[PDB]
């Protein structure tokens, strides 16, 4: 909630104060340090099945 | 009409702006030009019943 009688100030000024969501970065951030292990695991059963 | 929600804002912004209405004023402003005429007028009349 903003204090004034401004059409459109409510939009503009929670945009400003909250580019983006704290949990959707934290989301973003666990998937991205989460992927490289799964690219391993992936690699080590395709290795596996060739030997 | 101001723009925004606060309650009070109103009443302290146009107290601000006009601490006395123009009409009120150029009243007090003909009666104080015109107090000194009437004086004058009966001090006159009082002078010419004792002549
Ligand atoms: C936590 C670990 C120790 C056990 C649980 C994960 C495993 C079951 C993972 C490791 C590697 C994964 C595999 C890596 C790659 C592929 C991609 C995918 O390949 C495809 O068939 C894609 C479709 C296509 O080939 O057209 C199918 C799943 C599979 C076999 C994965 C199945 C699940 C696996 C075996
Ligand atoms: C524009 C001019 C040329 C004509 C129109 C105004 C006159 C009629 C004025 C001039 C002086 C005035 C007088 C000046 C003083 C007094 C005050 C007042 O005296 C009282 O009797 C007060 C009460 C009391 O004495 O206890 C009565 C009106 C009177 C006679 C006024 C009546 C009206 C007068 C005559
Ligand atoms: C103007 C606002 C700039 C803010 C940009 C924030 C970028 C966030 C990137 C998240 C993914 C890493
Ligand atoms: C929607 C609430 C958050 C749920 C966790 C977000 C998903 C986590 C995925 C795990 C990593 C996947 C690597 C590709
Ligand atoms: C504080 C505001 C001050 C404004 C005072 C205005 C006085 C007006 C006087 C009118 C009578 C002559
Ligand atoms: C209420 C609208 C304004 C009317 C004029 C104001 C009165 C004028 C009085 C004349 C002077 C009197 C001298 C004592």
Same mark, same amino acid.
């Given at each position: /909630?903003?204090?004034?009688? *401004?059409?459109?100030?409510?939009? #503009?000024?929670?945009?400003?104060?909250?580019?983006?969501?704290?949990? /959707?970065?934290?989301?973003? *951030?666990?998937?991205?340090?989460? #992927?490289?292990?799964?690219?391993?695991?992936?690699?080590?059963?395709?290795?596996?099945?060739?030997?």
């Amino acid at each position: /909630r903003c204090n004034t009688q *401004q059409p459109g100030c409510e939009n #503009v000024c929670y945009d400003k104060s909250f580019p983006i969501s704290h949990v /959707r970065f934290w989301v973003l *951030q666990i998937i991205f340090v989460s #992927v490289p292990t799964l690219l391993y695991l992936a690699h080590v059963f395709y290795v596996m099945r060739k030997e």
